[PDB]
């Protein structure tokens, strides 16, 4: 009966942040207390929500947005926010209902001379709508000047690798992020309790 959280959180590999995973969770029982005061997790901010009251309260769906950023960017996995991530990788909506977990993952997701495999969208033509994902491999027009599709002056390839080394300072270390988002639109309850 019990919910498959251990596969989101205790996962082998995680999403680059432009390319952000999700599972929807349904038709199962959710003890969230083994998240809040798990306290293995660094950051833990609930919006719309007392983090007691959810642990016996009910939803149509829980959706669980697994991905990986720099520590200094964790500020942006939050409503009303601004800059590279909330603009170009993953937004949240301004009246978000849900929780935001991260934890420092330098021990895992850094390597000797830099893990390239987590990644982020620099520039984009406009800002993302709430829970937009983008995977564009398509050159950015910085200038008025045309691209010829040649990467070059004012003509930039819009994704980058972060390149996490363990010798980094704490803000430029990788944090693993989950975003539990809660809904109840109108057909039936599927996730509570006990």
């Amino acid at each position, epitope marked *: 009966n019990l919910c498959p959280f251990g596969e989101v959180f205790n996962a082998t*590999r995680f*999403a*680059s942040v*432009y*390319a952000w*995973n*999700r*599972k929807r969770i349904s038709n199962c029982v959710a003890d969230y207390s083994v998240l809040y005061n798990s306290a293995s997790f660094s950051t833990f901010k609930c919006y719309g929500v007392s983090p007691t009251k959810l642990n016996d309260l009910c939803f149509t769906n829980v959706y669980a947005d697994s991905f990986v950023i720099r520590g200094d960017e964790v500020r942006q996995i939050a409503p009303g926010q601004t800059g590279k991530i909330a603009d170009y990788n993953y937004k949240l909506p301004d009246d978000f209902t849900g929780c935001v977990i991260a934890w420092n993952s330098n021990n895992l997701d850094s390597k000797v001379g*830099g893990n*390239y*495999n987590y*990644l982020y969208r620099l520039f984009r033509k406009s800002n993302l709508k709430p829970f937009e994902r983008d*995977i564009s*491999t398509e*050159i950015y027009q910085a200038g008025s000047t045309p*691209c010829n*599709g*040649v*990467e*070059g*002056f004012n*003509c930039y*390839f819009p*994704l980058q*690798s972060y*390149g996490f080394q363990p010798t980094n300072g704490v803000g430029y270390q990788p944090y693993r992020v989950v975003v539990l988002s809660f809904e109840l639109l109108h057909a039936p309850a599927t996730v509570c309790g006990p």
Partner: nanobody
Amino acid sequence: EVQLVESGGGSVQAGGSLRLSCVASGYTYCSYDMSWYRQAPGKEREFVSIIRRDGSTAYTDAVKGRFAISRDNAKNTLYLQMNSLEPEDTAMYYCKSWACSSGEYLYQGDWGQGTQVTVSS
């Protein structure tokens, strides 16, 4: 999952040519757009070229009208043809599968081991 692997590098005379070969394997729910990158060792890991699913190339201005990117999906093999090599184009060269989708499975991308290209006077 994908294991990518590069091949067909090494030392050569300036002005000559080389063909780099990115062999794939056990694949995913997607055809990934694919790219080449190099490490001008010192300068960071830097963009060389792309071919998409839709088949459009783009190249970095450095190698324009000198290098060429192509795939033979039969072999599941990706080609960088490099003509008119200078010593600047020494580096470890890497192939890069990108992100692509298919309805919830979300292939992140992968890099390969690389192959050292080397050029002289």
